[PDB]
Each structure stands twice: as structure tokens, then as C-alpha cells.
């Protein structure tokens, strides 16, 4: 099974992906 | 709409004559038509022989016969090159 | 309450005579749902002979109407002032068409 801490590691990496998605979207938007 | 690049050494290959210019043969532009015709017949016989020797394919085949069987499709391109050179006076 | 009304019979051509189903009363045909049988029984018809006389009466009226349409366009066409009589037309269509029609049917 998966522990909650492992879920929290997944949420941290998905947050980092959200920040990079915003920065790419703003670069595309100019 | 913008210049389309092609590699260095790109030349004009459009032909409206009986045969294309010998430039269409690439590195084989200087080979004579007699040499292509004889190489084509040689490659066809060796390729057909090697192909015939391995038609019942088994788990362990002779590797050289496999490589030699590739000469049959190569011979088609060789006799096309022989027709091109003979009609270019080479 | 047992026989199913049927007044349409098909010809046997391409297997289509399967449509002549067993409606009852020693008969085969297409079951009809227009309620004509109940109209005729309410009228008191009780026989096919009187239905032949009604069919002839319809044919005679049909000939008289097509004659009248020809006659009133090609021989005797009313002028516009005849058609522009709304009071006269209503008097005749209420009293004459509806009232006499109801009275004759009541008789």
C-alpha cells in the first residue's frame, strides 16, 4: 500500500509541475 | 515562403530526356553500363542462389547465405542503373 | 365482440397474401380501424345490399359535385358581389346546412 507521506511527495512534485506549467503558459501567452 | 534548405551537394535532377543524367546514380555516376549490367546479372544469380539455399528457414541458418540473399532486390536497381548509363553513352 | 373488422383484401403476388390474416367470421383480410362498421351499425344498415346503395349514392354525389365545379367556373360563374354576402351565407350555413342537417339526421 501507499502511505500518506508518499501521497504528499506526489502532491509536491505536481505542485512543481503546476508552477512550471504557469511559467510556460505565460511565456506562450507573451 | 522562406528559403527551404537542402544539403550541400544538392543539384538539379529533373530530366525530360530519354534517360536521366548520370548524376542520379550518386557515387555510381562514373560506373559504365557494361559494369552495371554484368554486376546486375551476377547479383541476381548469387542472390537467387543464396535465397534458394535458405527457403526452408531454420533456427540456425548460414549467416552468409542470408546476407547474400539481399543481392536479388539490389540487382533490380543495378539493371535500372545499367539502362540509365547505356542511354547516357557510358 | 368476436369478429375483427376487415374491409381490405390483398392479391397474392410476392408472398404478400400473408397480410390476409384471420380476422374472424370465415374471412381473411387486413383488419381495418376506421370504425366504419360501428357507424354502419349505428345507422342501422344490417346488410351488404344497403351498403351497395350507399356506395352508389356517394358515386352520384361525386359526379354531381364535379359537374357543379365545371358549371360554376365555365358556364355560370358568380360575380364578386355574390360572394361578398357574409350575412346571407351565415344565415344559410347555420339554419340550412347545420340546422336542417341535424334535423334530417334526427329524423
Amino acid at each position: 500500500m501507499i502511505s500518506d507521506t508518499q501521497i504528499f511527495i506526489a502532491l509536491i512534485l505536481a505542485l512543481v509541475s503546476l508552477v512550471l506549467a504557469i511559467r510556460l503558459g505565460r511565456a506562450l501567452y507573451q | 515562403f522562406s528559403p527551404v534548405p537542402s544539403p550541400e551537394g544538392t543539384k538539379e535532377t529533373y530530366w525530360e530526356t530519354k534517360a536521366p543524367s548520370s548524376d542520379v546514380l550518386g557515387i555510381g555516376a562514373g560506373v559504365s553500363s557494361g559494369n552495371f549490367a554484368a554486376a546486375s546479372v551476377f547479383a541476381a544469380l548469387v542472390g537467387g542462389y543464396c535465397t534458394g539455399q535458405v527457403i526452408p528457414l531454420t533456427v540456425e541458418p548460414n549467416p552468409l547465405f542470408l546476407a547474400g540473399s539481399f543481392l536479388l532486390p539490389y540487382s533490380w536497381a543495378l539493371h535500372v542503373a545499367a539502362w540509365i548509363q547505356k542511354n547516357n553513352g557510358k | 365482440t368476436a369478429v375483427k373488422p376487415s374491409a381490405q383484401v390483398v392479391w397474392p403476388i410476392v408472398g404478400q397474401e400473408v397480410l390476409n390474416g384471420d380476422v374472424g367470421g370465415g374471412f381473411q383480410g387486413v383488419q381495418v380501424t376506421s370504425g366504419f362498421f360501428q357507424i354502419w351499425r349505428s345507422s342501422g344498415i344490417t346488410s351488404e345490399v344497403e351498403l351497395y346503395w350507399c356506395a352508389l349514392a356517394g358515386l352520384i354525389m361525386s359526379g354531381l359535385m364535379i359537374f357543379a365545379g365545371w358549371f360554376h367556373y365555365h358556364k355560370a360563374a358568380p360575380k364578386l358581389e355574390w360572394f361578398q354576402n357574409a350575412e346571407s351565407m351565415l344565415n344559410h350555413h347555420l339554419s340550412g346546412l347545420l340546422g336542417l342537417g341535424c334535423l334530417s339526421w334526427a329524423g
Binding site: M1, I2, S3, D4, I7 | - | -
Partner: protein, 34 residues
Amino acid sequence: MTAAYLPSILVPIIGLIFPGLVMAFAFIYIEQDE
């Protein structure tokens, strides 16, 4: 389920707050002259 409190936290936020916030800010952005 492990961390079973998470659907009961995240589903109302994602399903109600996230669209309510993007509708509000998209509405403001698309109706500004400058």
C-alpha cells in the same frame, strides 16, 4: 483507503471553488478594456 480525508477535502474545492474562481477571474479579464 489511505489518506481517506483527501477526497472529502479536494473534491468540493476542485469542483466548486476552482470553477468559481476561474469564472470570476475570466469574467473580469474578458471584460476589461485595458
